[PDB]
Design an enzyme around this catalytic site. Sequence first.
Site, mmCIF file in Angstrom:
data_model
loop_
_atom_site.group_PDB
_atom_site.id
_atom_site.type_symbol
_atom_site.label_atom_id
_atom_site.label_comp_id
_atom_site.label_asym_id
_atom_site.label_seq_id
_atom_site.Cartn_x
_atom_site.Cartn_y
_atom_site.Cartn_z
ATOM 1 N N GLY A 48 -57.149 7.473 34.609
ATOM 2 C CA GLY A 48 -57.264 7.293 33.169
ATOM 3 C C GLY A 48 -57.634 5.865 32.776
ATOM 4 O O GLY A 48 -57.366 4.922 33.523
ATOM 5 N N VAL B 144 -56.316 2.987 35.344
ATOM 6 C CA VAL B 144 -55.308 3.377 36.299
ATOM 7 C C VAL B 144 -55.903 4.267 37.388
ATOM 8 O O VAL B 144 -56.557 5.271 37.093
ATOM 9 C CB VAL B 144 -54.177 4.128 35.573
ATOM 10 C CG1 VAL B 144 -53.053 4.438 36.503
ATOM 11 C CG2 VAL B 144 -53.646 3.299 34.428
ATOM 12 N N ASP C 170 -50.039 14.513 33.027
ATOM 13 C CA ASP C 170 -49.545 13.926 31.803
ATOM 14 C C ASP C 170 -49.441 15.022 30.715
ATOM 15 O O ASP C 170 -50.083 16.065 30.805
ATOM 16 C CB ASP C 170 -50.312 12.635 31.431
ATOM 17 C CG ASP C 170 -51.599 12.867 30.683
ATOM 18 O OD1 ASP C 170 -51.740 13.903 30.009
ATOM 19 O OD2 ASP C 170 -52.526 12.007 30.689
ATOM 20 N N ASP D 251 -45.277 3.099 21.880
ATOM 21 C CA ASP D 251 -46.469 3.947 22.027
ATOM 22 C C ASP D 251 -46.091 5.297 22.638
ATOM 23 O O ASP D 251 -46.790 5.812 23.479
ATOM 24 C CB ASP D 251 -47.548 3.229 22.869
ATOM 25 C CG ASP D 251 -48.974 3.799 22.676
ATOM 26 O OD1 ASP D 251 -49.255 4.456 21.640
ATOM 27 O OD2 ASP D 251 -49.892 3.604 23.528
HETATM 28 N N1 ANP Z 1 -47.802 6.161 37.583
HETATM 29 C C1 ANP Z 1 -48.735 7.082 37.264
HETATM 30 N N2 ANP Z 1 -48.897 8.214 37.982
HETATM 31 C C2 ANP Z 1 -49.807 9.147 37.669
HETATM 32 N N3 ANP Z 1 -50.656 9.033 36.625
HETATM 33 C C3 ANP Z 1 -50.568 7.858 35.821
HETATM 34 C C4 ANP Z 1 -49.601 6.833 36.109
HETATM 35 N N4 ANP Z 1 -49.789 5.882 35.203
HETATM 36 C C5 ANP Z 1 -50.798 6.324 34.386
HETATM 37 N N5 ANP Z 1 -51.290 7.526 34.767
HETATM 38 C C6 ANP Z 1 -52.389 8.256 34.104
HETATM 39 O O1 ANP Z 1 -53.300 7.279 33.636
HETATM 40 C C7 ANP Z 1 -53.401 7.231 32.203
HETATM 41 C C8 ANP Z 1 -53.456 5.832 31.644
HETATM 42 O O2 ANP Z 1 -52.257 5.202 32.046
HETATM 43 P P1 ANP Z 1 -51.652 4.218 30.950
HETATM 44 O O3 ANP Z 1 -50.562 3.356 31.686
HETATM 45 O O4 ANP Z 1 -51.345 5.085 29.659
HETATM 46 O O5 ANP Z 1 -52.853 3.262 30.617
HETATM 47 P P2 ANP Z 1 -53.647 3.104 29.247
HETATM 48 O O6 ANP Z 1 -55.136 3.584 29.639
HETATM 49 O O7 ANP Z 1 -53.765 1.561 29.054
HETATM 50 N N6 ANP Z 1 -53.257 3.994 27.811
HETATM 51 P P3 ANP Z 1 -51.995 5.234 27.535
HETATM 52 O O8 ANP Z 1 -52.484 6.747 28.099
HETATM 53 O O9 ANP Z 1 -51.971 5.258 25.882
HETATM 54 O O10 ANP Z 1 -50.753 4.579 28.101
HETATM 55 C C9 ANP Z 1 -52.292 8.115 31.663
HETATM 56 O O11 ANP Z 1 -52.550 8.791 30.458
HETATM 57 C C10 ANP Z 1 -51.866 8.915 32.874
HETATM 58 O O12 ANP Z 1 -52.661 10.104 32.815
#
Ligand code: ANP
EC number: 2.7.11.1
Length: 274
Positions: free
Chosen positions: A13, A20, A96, A135
Amino acid sequence: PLESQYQVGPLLGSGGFGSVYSGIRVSDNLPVAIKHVEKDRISDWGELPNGTRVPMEVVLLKKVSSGFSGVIRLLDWFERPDSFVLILERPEPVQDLFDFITERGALQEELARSFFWQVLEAVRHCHNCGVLHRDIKDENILIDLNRGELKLIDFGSGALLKDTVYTDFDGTRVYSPPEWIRYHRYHGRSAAVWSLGILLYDMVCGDIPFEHDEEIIRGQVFFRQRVSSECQHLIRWCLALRPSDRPTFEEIQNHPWMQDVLLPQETAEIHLHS
Ligand SMILES: Nc1ncnc2c1ncn2[C@@H]1O[C@H](COP(=O)(O)OP(=O)(O)NP(=O)(O)O)[C@@H](O)[C@H]1O
């Protein structure tokens, strides 16, 4: 050492503050998530107990780390010239909540009750550790499919918890409270509860209740799906226009709609076909 203690896999994502990726810790094959955040895109900066300039996300994650599975555990972190890299635990299999609801549509109330209870337990843990997430939303919640356990992620918009007024916000608008929209002022707990209300509506209806500022300010909730009166009541309470009219975490968890919650493992057996 050096970042290559890990084997990088697919992008999971992006679009929020970070990108990530799926990864694996070379030393013991442990599954991890590798989150990259550009230094220029970091809203709030903080400093570590030992005196070091790092992203607030690392500060907050360190503050909430422990044996409690309700919040994602930060395993390690690295600084590069133009970014920070965070090594996070990764459940497998996992999905998610945004994807889960997108795929399955509105959740049956027994499932929403279990999920929502777990989110509550996770948010309460954060606040007890002095951290305000800011958030809370479907995309920022992971479902460990085999265990039926939910995990809160993404502290990139977070802040240290305080009892005074917040005049800054960088989370998701359509999850933000009317007091933010109108006066750019809110208190942490009551704003968190508003977001929980949006989250619960999303779970039982399959989508969020408000799209425009005007709808948030009006705060009128309409149900497009059949939802029990007890659930409707809780949602509408969380979404009270006046912050002081919203329920505390204790009142939410003592609400009739929240009684007799399934255990995570029970939840997975019945609803996530273990
Ligand atoms: N530890 C994890 N294990 C598996 N999937 C993850 C993990 N961290 C994040 N993801 C996936 O990656 C996406 C983005 O992570 P995130 O920490 O949310 O970053 P973001 O792009 O900055 N925005 P957000 O989705 O609002 O937090 C998420 O919506 C999850 O689908």
